[PDB]
Amino acid sequence: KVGRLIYTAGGYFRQSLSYLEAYNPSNGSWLRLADLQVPRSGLAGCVVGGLLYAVGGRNNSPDGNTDSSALDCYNPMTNQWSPCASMSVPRNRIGVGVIDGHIYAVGGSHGCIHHSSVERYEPERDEWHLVAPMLTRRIGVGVAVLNRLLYAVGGFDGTNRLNSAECYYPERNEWRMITPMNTIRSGAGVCVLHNCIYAAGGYDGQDQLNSVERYDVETETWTFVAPMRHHRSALGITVHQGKIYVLGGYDGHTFLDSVECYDPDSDTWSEVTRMTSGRSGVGVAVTMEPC
Numbered sequence: 001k002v003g004r005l006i007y008t009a010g011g012y013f014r015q016s017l018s019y020l021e022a023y024n025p026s027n028g029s030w031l032r033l034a035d036l037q038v039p040r041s042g043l044a045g046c047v048v049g050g051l052l053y054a055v056g057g058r059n060n061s062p063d064g065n066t067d068s069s070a071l072d073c074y075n076p077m078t079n080q081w082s083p084c085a086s087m088s089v090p091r092n093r094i095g096v097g098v099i100d101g102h103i104y105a106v107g108g109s110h111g112c113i114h115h116s117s118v119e120r121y122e123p124e125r126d127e128w129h130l131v132a133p134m135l136t137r138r139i140g141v142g143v144a145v146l147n148r149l150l151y152a153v154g155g156f157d158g159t160n161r162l163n164s165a166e167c168y169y170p171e172r173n174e175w176r177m178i179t180p181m182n183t184i185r186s187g188a189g190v191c192v193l194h195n196c197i198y199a200a201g202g203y204d205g206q207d208q209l210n211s212v213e214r215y216d217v218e219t220e221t222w223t224f225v226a227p228m229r230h231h232r233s234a235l236g237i238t239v240h241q242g243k244i245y246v247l248g249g250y251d252g253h254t255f256l257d258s259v260e261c262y263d264p265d266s267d268t269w270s271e272v273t274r275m276t277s278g279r280s281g282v283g284v285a286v287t288m289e290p291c
């Protein structure tokens with residue numbers, strides 16, 4: 001269990017960013033690692049087999065905006081990125097979850113197109129294949145996996161921001177609606193901790209949110225927990241050693257550098273570090289330290 005870092009890839013501040021930086025909770029240090037080959041915001045990060053994957057996003061740049069169909073792999077042992085097979089379609093503001101060593105890419109946008117489509121990547125074969133689409137088109141969607149079931153939470157369908165959520169049952173290749181959240185959330189951070197799916201922050205159509213709610217997969221209810229110190233949309237999120245970490249985002253005024261940590265035992269958030277610069281739209285995942 002030792003030696004793991006929180007990696008943050010990409011993001012946005014004025015333009016999309018290529019940064020890969022890794023935080024060590026055991027000593028408070030940050031490392032700057034190999035830049036992404038292409039800057040991207042609105043991507044997602046995940047880890048399979050000790051390798052960090054960066055999925056989708058968009059390169060917002062002075063010379064144009066290009067939505068990304070890319071899958072790229074970072075190996076901490078070599079500090080190098082390698083391209084993988086690309087997805088069927090570009091997906092900005094994507095959500096991603098991993099089940100049994102397979103990466104699911106969910107929703108996202110391509111220009112004015114808001115996807116309901118979903119595809120699954122097989123690292124051993126370096127292939128993507130489409131699976132059943134969601135019941136709702138969702139961009140800015142939060143995704144997490146609990147008990148080998150995949151959840152898609154909130155987002156924007158092209159007309160309205162959403163409080164709805166749905167679950168994918170892989171052995172039936174089928175999506176079903178679950179109880180909706182109490183709050184509309186686009187661009188929330190969504191993760192799994194213990195028996196619950198958490199949705200932290202986001203934008204409700206009027207304001208960035210500091211509230212946080214969790215869905216108990218047995219009781220099918222959403223319950224609010226302690227709010228974050230900062231309102232934030234387009235935040236990064238991950239879980240490490242039993243605590244939720246939220247990174248960056250936009251608070252309605254500033255691109256945040258703060259990283260907050262949620263302790264479920266005390267139901268409290270604390271500010272634990274700051275990124276090297278404020279940014280939104282990052283991808284985040286946990287794997288072994290490099291070299």
Ligand SMILES: O=C(N[C@@H](C(=O)O)c1ccccc1)c1cccc2c1-c1ccccc1C2=O
Nearest residue numbers: 093140156161186187202203208233234250280
């Ligand atoms: O929170 C906002 N927007 C969310 C939405 O539209 O649902 C969203 C959700 C997910 C990804 C991107 C955006 C929002 C509202 C007004 C002004 C601004 C933003 C914003 C967000 C991120 C970076 C910069 C800004 C910014 O200047």
